[PDB]
Scaffold this active site. Structure first.
Site, PDB file in Angstrom:
ATOM      1  N   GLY D   9       0.814  -1.186   0.000  1.00  0.00           N
ATOM      2  CA  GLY D   9       0.000   0.000   0.000  1.00  0.00           C
ATOM      3  C   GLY D   9       0.846   1.233   0.000  1.00  0.00           C
ATOM      4  N   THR D  10       2.032   1.210   0.642  1.00  0.00           N
ATOM      5  CA  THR D  10       2.977   2.238   0.578  1.00  0.00           C
ATOM      6  C   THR D  10       2.527   3.510   1.242  1.00  0.00           C
ATOM      7  OG1 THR D  10       3.546   1.354  -1.613  1.00  0.00           O
ATOM      8  CG2 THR D  10       4.643   3.374  -0.925  1.00  0.00           C
TER       9      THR D  10
END
Lengths: 250, 233, 223, 205, 233, 204, 245, 243, 206
Positions: D9-10
């Site tokens: 998802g970062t």
């Protein structure tokens, strides 16, 4: 700073006998009764499960172990020696005949690995023999049904019936008489139960009795009813209830 | 009985110490006698060297381990070599790794561990040779007694070797005098010669026998051997 | 290939197609992509043929060794972790894209594994060359209150989507129903929906055009 | 790296407040451009009071956290309960020692009752750094201004859930390798609360 | 084989007639993002040496643990007199440089450049250099990184030879140090606003000023604007 | 030079009714220059036949490994190995040599002598197990060979008819090559008599 | 004899082998150490015997540090004691690197504990002839532990080992009970000095030098220091008022 | 060889002296222990004797928490008890990582057993005399009580006791179990199980216990805890008002 | 102590014999009889199965007769257990000559590798030696039939007729008379059996 010891713990004596092995022959004698009958049409092995506190359970103990699915093994001698040996034996059978092959091991060939292990521990100091003698009962498609005996030295011999544990000679002698030629697996169970009854006294229950046959492999023993993809167990333990029915039927 | 407690090094006896430690201790005394004294600025070692014969000659037993560090032995020559080699590696590393001249306290503790370790085996053994390890670093001069048991004590003067006590009692007397002679190479050398003579009672005091070694405030490790001790007698 | 796994509220279905290709030419109408690890832990594998099968036998062995040792059922999570540690050591050298499924006393489970080294847990998962077309069917038609008949029927549809739109996929479809309650069913060749590459017929060869330079016989022997 | 493109998802953060720490992340694995997983766990337990948020590459992170789980299971058992900073060291060791083959960006976030919540950020190269709040992933850069004004030492539990709910929903809106549900893990003295908000909910609030 | 992913910049230092001064901003970069500010670059070792590190933060945390080991083991086997035989600048220097030199020789490098500064309690001034390349040198002024480029010519004007040393008192030297840093903050943005400044005095030992920020600001440039990047349509 | 196509070689196996047949060339080359009209690329241990095509150095080293493995196993069990068991033995040996740099295409052929099945099974460069019984092909010209087998072959054939198939199928695929001339052999196997027929064919 | 006087390789009916019994003895022939737990700290004290005038004060001290907050003092054989702390130091250093924390006192105790237990299940590796009393202040509070040749350890409020161990513990349980725990770290030093004094009667043939140390949270601020100077002289003086033996 | 009084081998009587003496001294800590299972829980009650007032009780334990769910009671001398605890805790932790699953009582049991049997053969290494009682509340078989002995033997129990008053406890347990004809106590809530246990203990060793004389550990679903002094006192109090 | 458990029974005696070796020679006389007859047309091997129950099977006759190679076989006098360790190592010894030179192992070499190994254990390792004798029956086209025997001391010799086990001396005495330079296999079969009947420690022969 240690692990520099390798002088033997099994030596020759002046009768050329082996010290540890004489000692271990007793250990087998102080065991409990276990037998094997090969009916040709299968193999039946039975033993007494007995336990060392009244608060213990022998229903939650086991003295027959599965070595590979289609093969089960039993012993007379000392509990500790049996557990470590079964583990090592289960290890080599998987590694060397299902990663190098895929067919489950022929019986005799499995006996030769158990024998090699036990003798290896007798040669080399810093370990001592295992204090146990096995009857390893199996099935293989190219042998048929089989029965082998492994002695505490590491020696083996085939037998079509044998007995071990207290009153060994006398139990075995009883089998010779009651069973001749080829008779059924079913019939041989009826006999095995009687033979085991005469050795023991003060326990007669099916929660202290374990009888198992190698004699059929069902989808019910396969864990799936689909199209087979492996042989699966030919080992089957008969229930405590199942044992109880047959004692009444003597 | 005796043979139980000599024949094994990974044992102990009822006294609180193994017999092998008693024999190793005896062996230091079987060495030839040597005294060590310091005032804590300079440290001197004065040593009586015996040689086997008139047809033998003297071989070294005062060992330069660095140009600021050394030892004398008393006890077993074979063992003494093993220990000296160890202290020498140890001196070298201390210079390369830390820029240090090595304190006696740090060296002793390290020599101890190895010794301990060889009683933690069969076919290893205590050294059975004692050393007076001197050096001049930044906390001054220092004199240590190392024993192959692992007992490390720093003493202001001491002796090891046969008839240690003779010099030691002389030393406990002259103590207060020598510690206030600070900064003198020559006064302390003269003392050492005087000291070693209170040990003697069955041996001769001669130029070639005696051997002097110094390190100190303005002296890196320099030995007087042979001829060059005559003028302090 | 197209390998899928689909959860229902009573069990799990995995399914695969069994076509191995060398070019567009069909080497094998049948090779199992569904491998048995233990009677109720079945694993589907995709990608390079040699790699998925070998890894699956090493693990297959270590898990059976485990089951006998503990005198208890094997867990799906043991097989999972063995697979992950094996990929990790070899840093991707194993090129196995796996869909590991199992039923235990803990319930029915469905995970998938990339060769890249990541694992995931899903309600339905798919992998393969048919992965996009199949995962599309499975997310759309999956629903709460899924059952056995609905889960087989969905599973048939999945493999089929991948057959049709990836034409490196084709041939028989093998399905394996694993229920918590009843003894698992491996359904070999549950559907026989596509056939062999093209033939024109062939016919007998005249013996005035097939000639032999010399011949002998010999015999097989064993001491 | 290990092998190929694995991505997550970062956008992760851990934030401190009056009762402890709330860590939040979005959950989504993609393998190229194929959506390997809608909803996953990037809020990974390594001890009951000590969790982490994982960023970097999904595989790498999972191997490394496995190893962490193993060392603290052993640390707890022998040497007693570990700090956030202690959890953080094991992470750092791995990251530094394997920077030449793995990329792992870890926020180790923990609640203790005797020093309150603590937030430790582990670089890709492997480092141990203390802050009152941290933002990491690469969508953390666009909410840096936001987080820095609207973070305050001391806030209510509802309110912290809004701050983290607002922060990440902006990150997921501009970012393209993010999506799926929002997970949170509240480590308080009221227990471990796991929060899930579904796509429709965070977009709106 | 290492590829820098993080930097710390700038340690400048000089000697004056009675001590040394060293100052450094506090910085953890991730390139151009000033990720971490609260990464100390000046790790005081004892109370007469400061170890200044620039370069990679990842190597720096590893060294940070070794520098703390260095204190610890020097209290081991030396209980007392730990400022005559422990925690000396030459030792700190030598310890660090051996690990550095070995790591770069086996292709797994410690990517830092380090200044070790002090006043020796056994000597006079200490200012000695070590880098990832293994080269070491002493000079009256030393600076690493961007400060090696920019600061050091300013500092060389203060002291560059033994003759220039008496001509720098406490006041002038501290003024130089403060001036230099401000130049660094101005013409390189990697440098943090926040700094630490340490003076290691031959009489006073280590006096460490924490949590300073650059001041006497330049804003002059804003007057002379004409554009330099501005576009017009 | 080439990985496996220095000396070339191609191999064909077919299934019938209580017979199988396995056929090979006899080429050995050194690049595109054919050197020899003899080189036997099929070996057998009792009633299991193993053809391995590819580079000769690698076919030889493997052949001696399987001979070893089988001999010592034969000795312990007091009977020969079975087609079915040998396929297992091969997979694993090959999976051990995937990491090593071998360049081989084995194909396994035999008839089970107490289960009464024709048996053929295949192996590759990767060393994956291929269960099919119709035809399996391997070698350089494996692409031409599948096209041909798949049209020419018809299921379940008597030995004579299996011969006409295998022979022509090989001969025509071979004629589109120069890496598969220099003579050829065909073996027709029943588990109680083996016929060897040499063919006469093209070379460069 | 029973064969277990020289073997560690077999089980004995005393529950423990005679060679472990022989090491315990060696502990009793060393010279007195105590440990005093306080409500803010811990205090260590040792007797060092003076026999000769040649000794130098506080360099032949049997009190050794591990780290900078952990105090270790022992009675019995000198080579065994140094070996022991030297192992503890390596393992501590390993801990410090790996978990980036100072060691806990219950953790250090295990770390030693397994090494001391290991050489009693091995015949080839010699028991320790020291009993070591150790403790400090940590992030869990202050802790005093004492480790035996057996590998036995437990948590203490006061602890003693060496020749005067019996006498010393008797005075100590009385004082530790009469107070809450021996009040604060300052008070404890005067009391400690009195114990070292009383204990010297069990040894009164040779002289002593009293050597005391501390690591106290509220009166040394998390570091280990020796207690010396004005304060050490003061404490001998206090003792000589009350006891006058 | 020629030695058996310096090294360990098979006896010709068949009763190995080292194993027998290991059976004997374990009791050198002045302990007596039991563990029972309730329907849902497994409770251990264990004695504590404090031999000095320079000692804190709260660092004195014979129950070590292996994992989060698994408990272990060691009856033995404490340097040997701890040696086993250190080894058991790591093997448990290692298993949990590798196999994704928390260690079974029986598997821990079996593994430590097989190792002690290995040390029994070994001529350079001795066996630990420790008797290890592994307990938990597994959810894959319920409550479980499995006891090892230093030999290499292990077997499953209905409830167990250890110490020299093993027989006396045994009888108290046998009587209860014959009467109900069940191998467990079916009392809902753990509390009532702990109290019952406490009654039977007071009968067997025939003394009233104090808060500082018992140490009680209870195993619950998916979590294991030792019970505190203040709580222990609540138990002793409440049985005084049944008559 | 480690050496204080050692007894050093692996060393030369004051008579210059090796204790453990002499004891192994004894072992072989308490195990069954084994007889080897070499004729120039075949080799006849018998080994005597002692302790024969009726519930011992008679479907096995490979349990002291072992093929080491497909032209070399042995008859064992000794234990199944001692033999088995060496038997596996022999079979391997076979495959090595076979793989390298692509032809059958010579007997004379293969025997030497076993004897050197037996010899090894009593010199070094602190080990027991194996209590086993082998009679080797094998064929070469460099020597015809060869027949060897190896025994527990690591000494090995060639024989053209040999006996080992119980009553060795007596069997051999009978063998020496009935032997004749001329041979056939079927003549040798009669010879073996006539002798076997007269060496049994039990009445008649079965």
């Amino acid at each position: 700073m240690t692990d520099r010891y390798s002088f033997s713990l099994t030596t020759f004596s002046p009768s050329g006998k082996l010290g540890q092995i004489d000692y271990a022959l007793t250990a087998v004698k102080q065991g409990v009764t276990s037998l094997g009958i090969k009916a040709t049409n299968g193999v039946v092995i039975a033993t007494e499960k007995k336990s060392s506190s009244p608060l213990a359970m022998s229903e939650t103990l086991s003295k027959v172990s599965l070595l590979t699915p289609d093969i089960g093994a039993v012993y007379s001698g000392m509990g500790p020696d049996y557990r470590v040996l079964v583990d090592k034996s289960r290890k080599v059978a998987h590694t060397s005949y299902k990663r190098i092959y895929g067919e489950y091991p022929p019986t005799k060939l499995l006996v030769s690995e158990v024998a090699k292990i036990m003798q290896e521990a007798t040669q080399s100091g810093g370990v001592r023999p295992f204090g146990v003698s096995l009857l390893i009962a199996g099935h293989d498609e190219f042998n048929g049904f089989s029965l082998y005996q492994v002695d505490p030295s590491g020696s083996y011999f085939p037998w079509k019936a044998t007995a071990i544990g207290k009153g060994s000679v006398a139990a075995k002698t009883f089998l010779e008489k009651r069973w001749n030629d080829e008779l059924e697996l079913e019939d041989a169970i009826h006999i095995a139960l009687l033979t085991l009854k005469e050795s023991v006294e003060g326990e007669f229950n099916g929660d202290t009795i374990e009888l198992a046959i190698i004699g059929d492999e069902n989808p019910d023993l396969l864990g799936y009813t689909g199209i087979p993809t492996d042989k699966g167990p030919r080992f089957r333990k008969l229930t405590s209830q199942e044992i109880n029915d047959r004692l009444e039927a003597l | 009985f005796r043979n139980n407690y000599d024949g094994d090094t990974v044992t102990f006896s009822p006294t609180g110490r193994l017999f092998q430690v008693e024999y190793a201790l005896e062996a230091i005394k079987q060495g030839s006698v040597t005294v060590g004294l310091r005032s804590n600025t300079h440290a001197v070692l004065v040593a009586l060297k015996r040689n086997a014969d008139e047809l033998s000659s003297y071989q070294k037993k005062i060992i330069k381990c660095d140009e600021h560090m050394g030892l004398s032995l008393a006890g077993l020559a074979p063992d003494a070599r093993v220990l000296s080699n160890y202290l020498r590696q140890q001196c070298n590393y201390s210079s390369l790794v830390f820029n240090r001249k090595l304190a006696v306290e740090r060296a002793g503790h390290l020599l101890c561990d190895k010794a301990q370790k060889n009683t933690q085996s069969y076919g290893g053994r205590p050294y059975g040779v004692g050393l007076l390890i001197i050096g001049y670093d930044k906390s001054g001069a220092h004199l240590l007694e190392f024993q192959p048991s692992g007992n490390v004590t720093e003493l202001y003067g001491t002796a090891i070797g046969a008839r240690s006590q003779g010099a030691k009692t002389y030393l406990e007397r002259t103590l207060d005098t020598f510690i206030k002679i600070d900064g003198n190479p020559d006064e302390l050398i003269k003392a050492g010669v005087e000291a070693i003579s209170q040990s003697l009672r069955d041996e001769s005091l001669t130029v070639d026998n005696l051997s002097i070694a110094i390190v100190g405030k303005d002296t890196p490790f320099t030995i007087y051997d042979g001829e060059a001790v005559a003028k302090y007698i | 290939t197209t390998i899928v796994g689909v959860k229902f509220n009573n069990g799990v279905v995995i399914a695969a197609d069994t076509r191995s290709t060398q070019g567009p030419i069909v080497a094998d109408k049948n090779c199992a992509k569904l491998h048995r690890i233990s009677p109720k832990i079945w694993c589907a594998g995709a990608g390079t043929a040699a790699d998925t099968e070998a890894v699956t036998q090493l693990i297959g062995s270590n898990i059976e060794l485990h089951s006998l040792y503990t005198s208890r059922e094997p867990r799906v999570v043991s097989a999972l972790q063995m697979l992950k540690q094996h990929l990790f050591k070899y840093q991707g050298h194993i090129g196995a894209y796996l869909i590991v499924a199992g039923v235990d006393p803990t319930g029915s489970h469905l995970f998938s594994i990339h060769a890249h080294g990541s694992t995931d847990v899903g309600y339905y998962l798919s992998l393969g060359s048919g992965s996009l077309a199949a995962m599309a069917v499975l997310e759309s038609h999956w629903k709460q209150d899924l059952t056995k008949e609905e889960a087989i029927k969905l599973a048939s549809d999945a493999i089929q989507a991948g057959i049709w739109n990836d034409l490196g996929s084709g041939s028989n479809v093998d399905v394996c129903v694993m229920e918590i309650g009843k003894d698992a069913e491996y359904l070999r060749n549950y559907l026989t929906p596509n056939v062999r590459e093209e033939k024109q017929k062939s016919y007998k060869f005249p013996r005035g055009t097939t000639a032999v330079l010399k011949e002998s016989i010999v015999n097989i022997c064993d001491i | 790296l290990k092998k190929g493109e694995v991505s997550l998802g970062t956008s992760i953060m851990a934030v401190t407040f009056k009762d402890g720490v709330i860590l939040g992340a979005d959950s989504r694995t993609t393998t190229g451009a194929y959506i390997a997983n809608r909803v996953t766990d990037k809020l990974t337990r390594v001890h009951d009071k000590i969790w982490c948020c994982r960023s970097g590459s999904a595989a790498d992170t999972q191997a490394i956290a496995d190893i962490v789980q193993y060392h603290l299971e052993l640390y707890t058992s022998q040497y007693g309960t570990p700090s956030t900073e202690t959890a953080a060291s094991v992470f750092k060791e791995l990251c530094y020692e394997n920077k030449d083959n793995l990329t792992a960006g870890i926020i180790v976030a923990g609640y203790d009752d005797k020093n309150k919540g603590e937030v430790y950020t582990i670089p890709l190269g492997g480092s141990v750094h203390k802050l009152p709040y941290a933002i990491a992933g690469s969508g953390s850069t666009f909410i840096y201004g936001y987080c820095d004004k609207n973070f305050r030492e001391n806030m209510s539990k509802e309110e912290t859930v809004d701050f983290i709910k607002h922060s990440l929903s902006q990150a997921i809106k501009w970012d393209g390798s993010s999506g799926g549900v929002i997970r949170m893990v509240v480590l308080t003295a009221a227990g471990v609360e796991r929060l899930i908000f579904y796509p429709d909910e965070y977009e709106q609030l | 084989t290492q590829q820098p992913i993080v930097t710390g910049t700038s340690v400048i230092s000089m000697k004056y007639d009675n001590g040394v001064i060293i100052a450094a901003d506090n910085l953890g970069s991730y390139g151009s993002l000033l990720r971490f500010n609260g990464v100390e670059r000046l790790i005081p070792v004892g109370d007469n040496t400061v170890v200044g590190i620039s370069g990679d933060i990842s190597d720096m945390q590893h060294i940070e643990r070794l520098l703390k080991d260095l204190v610890t083991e020097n209290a081991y086997d030396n209980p007392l007199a730990d400022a005559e035989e422990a925690l000396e600048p030459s030792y700190i220097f030598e310890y660090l440089a051996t690990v550095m030199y070995q790591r770069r020789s086996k292709m797994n490098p410690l990517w830092n450049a380090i200044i070790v500064a002090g006043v020796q309690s056994n000597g006079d001034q200490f200012l000695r250099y070590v880098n990832l390349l293994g080269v070491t040198y002493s000079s009256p002024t030393l600076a690493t990184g961007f400060g090696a480029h920019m600061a050091n010519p300013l500092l060389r004007k203060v002291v560059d030879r033994e003759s220039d040393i008496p001509k720098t008192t406490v006041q002038v030297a501290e003024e130089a140090i403060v001036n230099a840093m401000r130049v660094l903050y101005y013409r390189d943005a990697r440098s943090s606003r926040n700094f630490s400044l340490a003076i290691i005095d031959k009489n006073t030992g280590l006096t460490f000023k924490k949590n300073l920020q650059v001041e006497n600001m330049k804003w002059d440039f804003a007057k002379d604007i004409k554009g330099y990047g501005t576009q017009k349509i | 030079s080439d990985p496996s196509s220095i000396n070339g070689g191609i191999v064909v196996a077919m299934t019938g009714k209580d017979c199988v047949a396995i056929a090979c060339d006899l080429r050995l080359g050194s690049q595109s220059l054919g050197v020899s009209n003899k080189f036997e690329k099929i070996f057998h241990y009792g009633h299991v036949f193993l053809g391995i095509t590819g580079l000769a150095t690698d076919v030889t080293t493997l052949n001696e490994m399987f001979r070893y493995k089988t001999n010592l196993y034969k000795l312990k069990e007091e009977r020969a190995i079975e087609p079915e068991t040998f396929t297992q033995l091969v997979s694993s040996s090959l999976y051990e040599r995937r990491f090593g740099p071998y360049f081989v295409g084995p194909v396994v052929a035999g008839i089970n002598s107490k289960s009464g099945k024709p048996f053929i099974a295949g192996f590759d460069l990767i060393g994956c197990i291929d269960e099919a019984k119709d035809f399996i092909v391997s070698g350089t010209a494996s692409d031409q060979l599948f096209g041909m087998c798949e049209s020419l072959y018809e299921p379940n054939l008597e030995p004579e008819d299996l011969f006409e198939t295998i022979s022509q199928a090989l001969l025509n695929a071979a004629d589109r090559d120069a890496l598969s001339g220099w003579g050829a052999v065909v073996y027709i196997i029943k588990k109680d008599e083996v016929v060897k027929r040499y063919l006469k064919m093209r070379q460069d | 004899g029973t064969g277990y006087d020289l073997s560690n390789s077999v089980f004995s009916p005393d529950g423990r082998n005679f060679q472990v019994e022989y090491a315990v003895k060696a502990v009793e022939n060393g010279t007195t150490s105590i440990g005093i737990k306080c409500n803010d700290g811990v205090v260590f004290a040792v007797e060092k015997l003076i026999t000769s005038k040649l000794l130098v004060p506080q360099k032949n001290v049997k009190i050794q540090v591990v780290d900078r907050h952990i105090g270790c003092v022992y009675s019995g054989l000198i080579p065994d004691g140094r070996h022991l702390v030297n192992r503890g130091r390596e393992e501590a250093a390993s801990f410090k690197k790996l978990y980036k924390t100072p060691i806990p006192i219950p953790a250090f105790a295990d770390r030693l504990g397994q090494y001391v237990q290991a050489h009693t299940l091995y015949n080839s590796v010699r028991p320790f002839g020291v009993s070591t009393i150790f403790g400090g202040v940590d992030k869990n509070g202050a802790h005093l532990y004492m480790l035996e040749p057996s590998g036995s350890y437990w948590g203490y409020k006061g602890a003693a080992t060496g020749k005067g161990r019996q006498s010393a513990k008797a005075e100590l349980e009385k004082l530790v009970d009469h107070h809450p725990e021996g009040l604060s770290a300052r008070e404890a030093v005067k009391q400690a000095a009195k114990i070292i004094y009383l204990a010297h009667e069990d040894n009164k043939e040779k002289d002593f030098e009293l050597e005391i140390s501390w690591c106290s949270l509220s009166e040394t601020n998390g570091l280990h220091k020796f207690v010396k100077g004005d304060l050490l002289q003061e404490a001998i003086d206090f003792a000589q008022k009350e006891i006058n033996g | 060889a020629g030695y058996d009084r310096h090294i360990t081998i098979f006896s010709p009587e068949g009763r190995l002296y080292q194993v027998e003496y290991a059976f004997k001294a374990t009791n050198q800590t002045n302990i007596n222990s039991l563990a029972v299972r309730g329907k849902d829980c497994t409770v251990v009650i264990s004695q504590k004797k404090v031999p000095d007032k320079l000692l804190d009780p709260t660092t004195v334990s014979y129950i070590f928490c292996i994992s989060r769910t698994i408990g272990m009671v060691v009856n033995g001398p404490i340097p040997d008890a701890r040696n086993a605890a250190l080894r058991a805790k790591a093997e448990a932790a290692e298993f949990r990582y590798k196999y994704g699953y928390d260690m079974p009582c029986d598997v821990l049991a079996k593994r430590m057993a097989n190792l002690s049997q290995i040390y029994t053969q070994r001529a350079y290494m001795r066996p630990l005399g420790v008797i290890l009682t592994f307990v938990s509340v597994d959810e894959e078989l319920g409550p479980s009580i499995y006891k090892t002995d230093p030999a290499g033997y292990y077997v499953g129990y209905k409830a167990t006791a250890t110490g020299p008053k093993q027989q006396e406890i045994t009888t108290n347990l046998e009587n209860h179990f014959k009467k109900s004809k069940i191998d467990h106590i079916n009392e809902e809530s753990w509390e009532k199980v702990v109290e019952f246990a406490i009654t039977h203990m007071i009968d067997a060793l025939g003394t009233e216990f104090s808060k500082n004389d018992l140490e009680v550990g209870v195993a619950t679903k998916d979590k294991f805890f030792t019970l505190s002094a203040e709580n222990i006192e609540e138990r002793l109090v409440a049985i005084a008002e049944q008559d | 102590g480690s050496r204080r458990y050692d007894s050093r029974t692996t060393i030369f005696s004051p008579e210059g014999r090796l204790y453990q070796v002499e004891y192994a020679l004894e072992s072989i006389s308490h195990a069954g009889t084994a007889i080897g007859i070499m004729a120039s047309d075949g080799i006849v091997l018998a080994a005597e199965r002692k302790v024969t129950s009726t519930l011992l099977e008679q479907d096995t006759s490979t349990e002291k007769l072992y093929k080491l190679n497909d032209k070399i076989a042995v008859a064992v006098a000794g234990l199944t257990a001692d033999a088995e360790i060496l038997i596996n190592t022999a079979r391997i010894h076979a495959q090595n000559y076979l793989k390298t030179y692509n032809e059958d192992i010579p007997v004379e070499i293969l025997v030497r590798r076993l004897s050197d190994i037996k010899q090894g254990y009593t010199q070094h390792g602190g080990l027991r030696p194996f209590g086993v004798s082998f009679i080797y029956a094998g064929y070469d086209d460099r020597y015809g039939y060869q027949l060897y025997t190896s025994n527990p001391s690591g000494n090995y010799t060639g024989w053209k007729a040999i006996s080992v086990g119980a009553n060795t001396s007596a069997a051999q005495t009978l063998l020496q008379m009935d032997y004749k330079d001329d041979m056939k296999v079927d003549d040798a079969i009669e010879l073996a059996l006539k002798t076997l009947s007269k060496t049994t420690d039990s009445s008649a022969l079965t």
